[PDB]
Every structure is written in C-alpha cells, then in structure tokens.
Amino acid sequence: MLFGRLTERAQRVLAHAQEEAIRLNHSNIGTEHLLLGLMKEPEGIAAKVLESFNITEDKVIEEVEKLIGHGQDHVGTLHYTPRAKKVIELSMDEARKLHHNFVGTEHILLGLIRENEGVAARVFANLDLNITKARAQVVKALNTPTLDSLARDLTVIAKDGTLDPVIGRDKEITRVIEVLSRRTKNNPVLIGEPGVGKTAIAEGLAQAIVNNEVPETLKDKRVMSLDMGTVGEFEERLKKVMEEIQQAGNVILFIDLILKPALARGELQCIGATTLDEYRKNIEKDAALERRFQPVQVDEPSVVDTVAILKGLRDRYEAHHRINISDEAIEAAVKLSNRYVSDRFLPDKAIDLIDEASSKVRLKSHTTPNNLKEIEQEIEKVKNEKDAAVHAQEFENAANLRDKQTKLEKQYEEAKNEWKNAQNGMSTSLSEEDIAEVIAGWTGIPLTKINETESEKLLSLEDTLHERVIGQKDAVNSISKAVRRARAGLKDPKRPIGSFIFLGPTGVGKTELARALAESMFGDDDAMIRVDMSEFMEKHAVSRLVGAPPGYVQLTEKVRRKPYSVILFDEIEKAHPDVFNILLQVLDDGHLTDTKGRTVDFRNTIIIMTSNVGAQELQDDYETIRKTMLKELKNSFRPEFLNRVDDIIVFHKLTKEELKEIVTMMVNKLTNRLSEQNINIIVTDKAKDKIAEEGYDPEYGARPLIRAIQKTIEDNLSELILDGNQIEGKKVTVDHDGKEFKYDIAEQ
Amino acid sequence: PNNLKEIEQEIEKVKNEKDAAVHAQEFENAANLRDKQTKLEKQYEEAKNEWKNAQNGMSTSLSEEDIAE
Amino acid sequence: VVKALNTPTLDSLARDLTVIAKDGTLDPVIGRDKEITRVIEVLSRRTKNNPVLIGEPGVGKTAIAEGLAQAIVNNEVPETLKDKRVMSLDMGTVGEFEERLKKVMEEIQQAGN
Amino acid sequence: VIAGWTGIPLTKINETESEKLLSLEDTLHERVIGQKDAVNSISKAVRRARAGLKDPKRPIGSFIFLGP
Ligand SMILES: Nc1ncnc2c1ncn2[C@@H]1O[C@H](COP(=O)(O)OP(=O)(O)OP(=O)(O)O)[C@@H](O)[C@H]1O
Ligand SMILES: Nc1ncnc2c1ncn2[C@@H]1O[C@H](COP(=O)(O)OP(=O)(O)OP(=O)(O)O)[C@@H](O)[C@H]1O
Ligand SMILES: Nc1ncnc2c1ncn2[C@@H]1O[C@H](COP(=O)(O)OP(=O)(O)O)[C@@H](O)[C@H]1O
Ligand SMILES: Nc1ncnc2c1ncn2[C@@H]1O[C@H](COP(=O)(O)OP(=O)(O)O)[C@@H](O)[C@H]1O
C-alpha cells in the first residue's frame, strides 16, 4: 500500500526530491533531497508547522548546503539511499498512530526528525526542534461472537497490513480458490512436511480479500482459524460455532487433525493442514471424509522463486538496518543457505542469514575510529577534576577547568560532526564475503572453501585426489572425468551425480579414495554415510534402510539431514536380492519414499558400491582389464543393473616403489599433527625400504604399514617427547644402519 | 477484464484525498473532490452494469481442450 | 576531613542492573568477550531479536546480562543500545498474578528503553 | 587444599606427569604378574595419545581383551 496511501501533495514532494538530484549531480537520493523538496510545496499541513516555528525556506537551504558536499555522478539509476527509506517506513507508522488512513506532507516532516542520523535530521536538531516539540504542533494545528472469541481472526490482522506481504505463493492461492469453488470435495487440505510453510498459506488468501482480488463467489468472507491449544468439557463449546457458521454463510474455518455430520452435508468449509504422515492414517481410512477432502501438494519454493521473494522483501530490511544490499549478495545468500543449511527448508533460512549479515556489517561499521574515545575520556576526567575542586574550596583552578571543559565539548561536537559527515558520505554495500563469514560459523566449514567459485575445484580434482591417494592414475582419472560430466549438465538432472563399482584387492585404498573424494567435493571428511551390507542378509532387513513399516516400531533418515554426502557400501555382493530393487530406483528415478510418505532427494549424492568379487582373478592396458572384469561381474549380478552404472573402477596391485610413497605420506601427515610443538621429522630412504618389507603382504595391502609405523616410529618418538621437551623445537632424523633403527637428534 | 481495476483505484485515491483534505481544514479543494468522487462512482456503476450485461449475454461451453489441459 | 571539607510499576518486581553496575560494587565481568557482542548483534536484528541463553545450569547464564549492562557505563555499546536500562524479572514471585504483568508490559512499551 | 575434597593422597597430586607414564610398565607389573606383551602393548599405546600423536577428538585408547 505505497501508492494507495500517498496523497497528491506527497507525490509532488517526491518528484521534487528526485529532480533535485539531477541538479545537484548526485547519483543517490539521500535524506537531504526530501527536506529540499518539502520546502518547495507550501500547501500542505507541514508548511504551517514550520511557519509557526520561525523557519523560512532560504535558511534551510543554506544550513543543509554546508553539511553536504559536491561531486560527480552517473546517468540514471537514481535509487533511494537506505536512510531515505526509513522515513517512508516511519511515515506509515506515524499515520497509523494518529488514527489516520493517509500519508501526506504532514508525516514526512515527522519521519525526517526521527532518523537522528541523516543530513535532514541535523537541520531540525540545530533549530532546537525535537520529536516531542513537533509532535504536539501538528496535533494542535490539525456477527458470530462465539467464533470471533474462541478462535483467532485472520482478516483483521491483514486489514491493518502490519505483516510482510505474501509474495511468491501465487500458485497455491489459485489452487485454493479453485478447490473452494468446486461443488464436491470443496474442502482443500494442505499436505506438506512441517517446515515448508502451511499456516502462512491462509494468510495469503486472506490478504487478497482486502485487495479485492477474489471473485464474487469468495467476496466478503472472514477467515477464521481454530487452534488446537484450546482443547469432554470442551465439546459443549464447539456445538454452537457450527450453528453460527451455518446461519452466517461467510465464515471459513481453518484447522490443523465429532464433525462427520458437519462435513457430510457441506455445512462447514474447513481447510485442513495435516501432514502427509497423518493424512493416510486419520483421513484416508475413513470413508466419510475421503469424499469431502482434496489434498493439495505444498512444498518449498524453488531457488528462482526465493530470489524474487528476497528482492521483494529487500526494502524492508534496508530500513531497519540502514545497510545497502546489492543484487549480487541476494543471489549468493540463497545459494549458500540452500547448500549448507538443510534443517529448516526454504524460505525461512534465506532471510535470517542476510539479516545477520546486515546486522554484523552495521555493527562493525558504526563504531568510533579511535577519535571520540580520547575526547570523551578527557571530558570525563576534567568533569571529575572540577567536581573534586568544588568540594575542596579551590576556586582558582575551577575557572580554568570550566574553560577547558567547554573547549573539550566544542572539540567533541566538531569531531562528531566531521566523523558522521564522512559516514553519511559513503555507502556500506553488502557482498558475498560478509555472508560467507556468517555462514562459516554455523557449520565450521573453513572460509577458504566457501569462497570457492566452483570452477577451479573440479579442474584441479585430479591433483587434489593424488595428495591423499598416491598411484592408480587410471582410477583417479576415470572418476574425475565422470564426475564433471554430470555437474556440467551433460547427464540427466534427475539421476544422481555418479555411480561407481570398486573392484580389486581388499585394503588397496577404496575407502581412502572415497574419503578423499568426499573431502575434495563437499569440503568435509565426515560427510560420508557408510552403509554396511553385511547386516542386510534376510528379507526382514530391507525395511531398515528404507523405513520401519507402521505397526512394528536408516539410510533415508541420514541422507535427509546431509543431502550432500557420499554413500559408501561395503560387500555389495553379499546382500538380499530385494536390496538391489531399492538401489536401482535411486539410480533410475533419483528419489525415494519412506513409509511416512516423505520424499528424500539423491541428486546431490555420489553412490559408491564396493564389491570383493574378481579379486581372485587379478592376483592370478586398463581397458582390457576392465573388459575382462566386466564379464565376471554380471555372472552374480543383475544383467540390467550394470547398465545403469556410470563407470566401473578397477584398482591395481601395489608395487614395491608405490609403498615408499605411502610411508612418506604417512610421515608427512604425522608431521602436520605436531605443528603446535614445531617438530620436524625426516625419514631417510633406507628406513622407508626397511619398514616396507616388515609388513609386506599382498592380501592386506597397505594395512600392515600402519602397525609397523606405530610400533617403530611413534614408540620411540613418544618416549623422547615425554622426557621433558627433549626434542622441542628440534630436528629428528630417522636412519636405518642395518641392524636397528638409529635416531639422530639434531638442531633446527 | 482490466476495466474496473483502474476505476476502483481512482475512486480509492479520490476518497483518500478527500479524507486528507478534510483534516487539513481546506474545504475549497474538497468541493471538487466530492463531485469527482460522485462522477467516478456513477461511471463505475455504469461500467460494471455494461460489463455484466455482456457476460450474461454470452455462454461458456466446455470443450475437449479444457479436459485435456 | 568532614568538618574541614522512571516506570515505578515495572521496577517493583524487577531489579535494575545498571544501577548496581554504576557503583562497581560487584566484580567486573571479564572473560565474556564473545557473548556481549553476540547479544548486541542479535538485539540489532529486525527478526528474531530476542536472544535466548542456552546452557546447562553451572556454566554461567544469569551473570551474562551483567556484562551487557557494564558496557553501558563504559560507553562501549553503540548509539542504538545507548542509555537503556536492563531489568531482570524474578521468577520466585509467582488469576491474581495475571493482573500484574499487564500493567508492566504497558509501561515497557511506552518507555521504549 | 584440593586433597581434602576427594581423598587423593598428597603423594599422588604432586606429580610432574612426565615420569609416571614412563615408569608405567614397572607399576603395572607390581599388581599383575606375567603376560609381559599385554602390559608393554598398552603402556606403549597409552603414552602416544598423551604426547599428541593421536587425534585430540578421539579418546585416549581402545583395546580388545581376548583369551581365557
Ligand atoms: N593410495 C594410497 N596412498 C597412501 N595410503 C593409502 C593409499 N590407499 C590406502 N592407503 C592407506 O590405507 C590405510 C587403510 O585404509 P582403510 O582402513 O580405510 O582401508 P582400505 O585400504 O581403503 O581398504 P578396505 O576397502 O578393505 O576398507 C589408510 O590409513 C591409508 O593411509
Ligand atoms: N596376572 C595376575 N597377577 C596377579 N593377580 C592376578 C593375575 N591374574 C589374575 N589375578 C587375580 O586373580 C583373582 C581372581 O580373578 P581373575 O583376575 O582370575 O578373574 P577375572 O579376570 O576378574 O575374571 P572374568 O573374566 O570372569 O571377569 C583376582 O582377584 C586377581 O587379583
Ligand atoms: N510467500 C512467502 N514468502 C516468504 N516467506 C514465507 C512465505 N510464506 C511463508 N513464509 C515463511 O514461513 C514461515 C512460517 O512457516 P510455517 O507456516 O510455520 O510452516 P509450517 O506451517 O510448516 O510450520 C514464516 O516465518 C515466513 O517467513
Ligand atoms: N566473565 C566472567 N568471568 C569470571 N567469572 C564469571 C564470568 N561470568 C560469570 N562468572 C561466574 O559465574 C557465577 C554466576 O553463575 P550463574 O550465572 O549463576 O550460573 P547459572 O546461571 O548457570 O546458575 C559467578 O559467581 C561468577 O563468578
């Protein structure tokens, strides 16, 4: 209700303020332009207020010109400063306070004086005029009682317009008014999980009533909602509400779960709000309500709709915080909130993030630049000295103290004015850097990962994986090339990011490769959901990872809280055949449905299945090996299951030269953990060869290497550490002389 | 059909301007506003009557395209 | 040396913290350098501007508000949070009790600080 | 003062926590006689977590006892 409340006189003032920026060569419309535009319209009520206060027009211009400056500007893009919209926001509040229904020129002056931060506020402040003095100047110069008492009305709240408008839910309003206009099943039921928005749906329907948007069929109908917090003694009160509604003919009920006769005859047009879990348990089982309800699919809005909602609601937050918000930050905040936070859905997680970012930047910017603190301390100490001198009957020093205090106060006022002029001159825009800092503190993701543009991360994936998984270039290149095709858009959007089958000897590094891929993609090492197929052997176990059937009492619950995770399966060849039917659905459709009816998404998860089959054949070119291993893979698996796999990964055996690099990587990783003590650890080539043959076993792979390192290097290092900081800040060298392990202690 | 919305907005803004002028102790400008509001109400009534007469004159029949949609 | 030298209703059941902090009789709140900033950050938001201290009893929750009032005397709070008295409601005081909060909440809104 | 709240003898509180872990093998053998490998393995495994070689988030250690 912006243009609907402004009168003809206010539009002239706004036009004058807009045209003043062109003459003043200002690219932004500040609070000073509104004051100048108001003095050029001596026809409204505000003219008489300033006339009685001995305030002319020429004095205001010369007073406001000194505070402001002059500079270059651009052509067009004449927007409003964040401080300027606060006056417009306060004018409506002032109009509502005085029991008025219009926004004229008499409210612009009142709103300009309540800012206390812009250029216009100081002009009134310097003329011994405050809010209290100007408040009285304009004032002196100027039915169904049971239902309305046992429930909460909605049209009354929407009539005043004190809440944010419902923007972006236009699709559901049309469906609701379409269902309400039907003859049979004219009682829509809002179906959706708690967290996507269901109570606010009726608020949007009620808002359109005031705007005269509903047709004549839905014209002049009050919206009433019956809360569940007010409920044998309560049954005597509901018998009269239904009778009152029937006699009125215009009351619309809104419930969230006796009333079977009321709904069978079409007497009450109630709107349900029950979730899908209870809809199939308290409504579908009853035939009386099955023929009178129409479910409506209500879910969270898409990413594009959230950007529009935030753009529509941008003006509201730019006034309470007085921080300019650019378009680049709005589109980034929604993406960041949808990427990391996955517990409250949309769009409630996109407004609080930008609100916190704006509050943080306003708090950081609105501080003292080490200028007023010293002056305030000097004023305080001078006042204390004067107070001490007064009680000491020392009037000789008090004369000098009073003059010093007056000079300090004058300097403090000048410094505050010159400090606030600079702050008013500049603009505090919001960028993605501020939002990244706020979002980093909620999950713990390092700032170096959030600021990534998701452009160089995929290109350097081959180098990142080799840091933790050395060797096996064929396995790394295949997955790096297969994961980027789905992200670019070459693959079907509904299918998951990728599906792979790990084959080869046990203990070769499949789990380490999965952990490295998860850390390099999602930025977290613990963002992996490990599902062990060893426990899924009987038919009764298939109801565990998909959901417990009703009447009796995993994967779906875990994947919902972490939509960005790598699913890892162990021993996929040992599982119940019914599990493959569930698994194929994930790869084909992309989403599952549990017993509660809630649908989980799998478009942001990498499915990795590890099988031990074919290990006995390798131990007895990469393309030839893949072709030979493919024939034996379908012998015990479904012929059509392997067609849905993006690629087959075959690992190779670990040679003698590859084992030295594993020990080197382990030593380097151990060194990083001792960064707090500044310990340098270096291992010679002889020691790496000596320790490699101790745990050399093709059956276990690199597993025996950890035990040898922990029993050889760590055991001797721990004793030296616990000798009273013997090697604190020094260099430790490990060299094998041939018989035992020689540890030489040096300096750093 | 994008006919009565503008007339309703004009009537609303004229009523709001008259209400603002009443509290401003400016009765000279309110005389024209009252006549303008009366003329706008008469025009709105005529436009609504002629719009609903045309709707009553015609009939809407369902086709196979609507069922398919 | 001696010879040679307001909202009263709202404050009836609540104790003002800044009055106690002005004299400096209690120990200064030193150590909560990250909680006062978080509280003043949450209080400066358009939505969800009512922070709630969550923690087990024994880590310190009532004393957190003392530090917020302490910064008022030291001129550390910004202009938005300048000259605002903080009152703590006593839970041990409580139909009969419903008539007292209505008068307190009306005065709190009118005071604005 | 702190000894009077838990009953811990003063000889136990006043320790540098540097020689107690080093002499853990001798201390355990006083009350447990035999099976030197089990005592040595746990004595070497428990001192690595306190030194800092083990991740701070994980606990001090985990052991599985097997045998009669
Ligand atoms: N390419 C590699 N380079 C260095 N170390 C590796 C490599 N592959 C595996 N490792 C090491 O293997 C060790 C064992 O890892 P983990 O216990 O996850 O088993 P795995 O070898 O992946 O086998 P499995 O698939 O049978 O569980 C890890 O500590 C890791 O350091
Ligand atoms: N190596 C040992 N040195 C000294 N005493 C020992 C040793 N092993 C066992 N004991 C003593 O044996 C006694 C009998 O209990 P024991 O330790 O044999 O069984 P346990 O380990 O407690 O049995 P369970 O496995 O059934 O719980 C104990 O009081 C213990 O002092
Ligand atoms: N059209 C909309 N635009 C922006 N935010 C909305 C819209 N509709 C609902 N919301 C948000 O949803 C929240 C209320 O959700 P609620 O109705 O409680 O969900 P549920 O009914 O599932 O508990 C409000 O805080 C509001 O910000
Ligand atoms: N910043 C601080 N520095 C030192 N001590 C503090 C600080 N904040 C609180 N305390 C201690 O906490 C105690 C009060 O705890 P209290 O708030 O009553 O805990 P709870 O609210 O859980 O009962 C005081 O005795 C005080 O010594």
Residue numbers in the entry:
A (entry chain K): 1 to 142, 159 to 247, 255 to 279, 281, 299 to 594, 601 to 667, 681 to 808
B (entry chain L): 410 to 478
C (entry chain J): 138 to 142, 159 to 247, 255 to 273
D (entry chain J): 479 to 546
What sentences appear in the manuscript?
The AAA+ protein ClpC and the peptidase ClpP form a major bacterial proteasome with crucial functions in bacterial stress resistance and virulence. ClpC forms a hexameric ring and threads substrates under ATP consumption through its central channel into the proteolytic chamber of associated ClpP for degradation. ClpC is usually repressed in an inactive resting state, where two ClpC spirals interact via coiled-coil M-domains. Antibacterial peptides and partner proteins trigger ClpC activation by binding to its N-terminal domain (NTD). This study reveals that the NTD stabilizes the resting state through multiple anchoring points to M-domains and ATPase domains.
